[PDB]
């Protein structure tokens, strides 16, 4: 297939090894040596998103800068797996550094809540743009997919699994590039792990089947994401989670007639039930994905350096603009006079 062109790819691969080696050194320093603020340093502006255990737009009083503040109710974080998972999220976000990961600025806790203050990404979630437009062209989806491929290559090299890929967790920045947010399920995993967690439509079969699993679940989820971006809906699609699980385990995927054959081939190898055959999980690792024909036009270095023109630049009216986010109920934020779950969150 390659003529010359192979030598350039090989050198590129050695450079990836060199980069990941330095990246691991930087990560470990921060991972082994991690209250950078308090609540009254900020003004509440707007709720940007809500889950079971919320993310708020806030304004730092002193500097006037805007941030996204994730608030976790300490008592609500149990829920069990919540506890460990909240500690995973903070420790991981304070140690990683990559162009497509949202940056944690401060973290702190009080009597009632845990707080993580992140850079505000005003372009909105991919989710709402995708639902509004319907589906992305294959070049458009490819541009976003490439950033996820590189982000997972980075995370997996640090023994980190992400475990909640979906358009809801992908923010579009002012240059049209992706920022991955929400590391609530991310975990450092040397080999296998066993927690049943994730989002139903994006769960790999081995999670559903209560098998010990590894980083290959992220590559399955990439297949789901690429399919959803290019089709407008995910490949395993039903009203109830139990029906979704049955379709996932069946090992059967149907594609829209407008999908290119290159796209279908890539997706069949990502959405592969057999782990001995799933792309990302073979001898050549991520390079089976990066060298796939569907990515033939992708300049991986140029993506990383953010040199590629983005498909879509979100409009920004100014600092603190929330026009690219949907509206949510604005519930009260209350802090108790008495500390709650102090010992159960000592490490935070």
């Amino acid at each position: 297939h390659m003529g010359a062109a192979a030598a350039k790819k090989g050198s590129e691969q050695e450079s990836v090894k060199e980069f990941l080696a330095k990246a691991k050194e930087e990560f470990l320093k921060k991972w082994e040596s991690p209250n950078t603020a308090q609540l009254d340093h900020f003004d509440r502006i707007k709720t940007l998103g809500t889950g079971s255990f919320r993310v708020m737009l806030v304004k730092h009083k002193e500097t006037g800068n805007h941030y996204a503040m994730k608030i976790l109710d300490k008592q609500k974080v149990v829920k069990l797996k919540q506890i460990e998972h909240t500690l995973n999220e903070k420790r991981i976000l304070q140690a990683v550094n990559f162009p497509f990961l949202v940056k944690l600025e401060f973290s702190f806790k009080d009597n009632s809540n845990l707080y993580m203050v992140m850079e505000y990404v005003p372009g909105g979630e991919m989710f709402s743009h995708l639902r509004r437009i319907g589906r992305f062209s294959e070049p458009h989806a490819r541009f976003y997919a490439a950033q996820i491929v590189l982000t997972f290559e980075y995370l997996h090299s640090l023994d980190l699994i992400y475990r909640d890929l979906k358009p809801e967790n992908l923010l579009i920045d002012q240059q049209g590039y992706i920022q991955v947010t929400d590391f609530g399920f991310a975990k450092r995993v040397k080999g296998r792990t066993w927690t049943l967690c994730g989002t139903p439509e994006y769960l790999a079969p081995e999670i559903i089947l209560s098998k010990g699993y590894n980083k290959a679940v992220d590559w399955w989820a990439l297949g789901v994401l690429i399919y959803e971006m290019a089709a407008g809906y995910p490949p395993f699609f039903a009203d109830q989670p139990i029906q979704i699980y049955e379709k996932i385990v069946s090992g059967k995927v149907r594609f829209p007639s407008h999908f290119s054959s290159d796209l279908k081939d890539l997706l069949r190898n990502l959405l592969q039930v057999d782990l001995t055959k799933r792309f990302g999980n073979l001898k050549n690792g991520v390079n089976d994905i990066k060298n796939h024909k569907w990515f033939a036009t992708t300049d991986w270095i140029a993506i990383y350096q953010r040199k590629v023109e983005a498909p879509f630049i979100p409009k920004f009216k100014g600092p603190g603009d929330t026009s690219n986010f949907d509206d949510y109920e604005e519930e009260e934020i209350r802090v108790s006079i008495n500390e709650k779950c102090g010992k159960e969150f000592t490490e935070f």
Binding site: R131, D164, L196, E201, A238, D239, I242
Partner: peptide
Amino acid sequence: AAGRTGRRQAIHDILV
């Protein structure tokens, strides 16, 4: 062809 079109909540410990 019917499925969930809104934001999807993640599951922490129990599948169904």
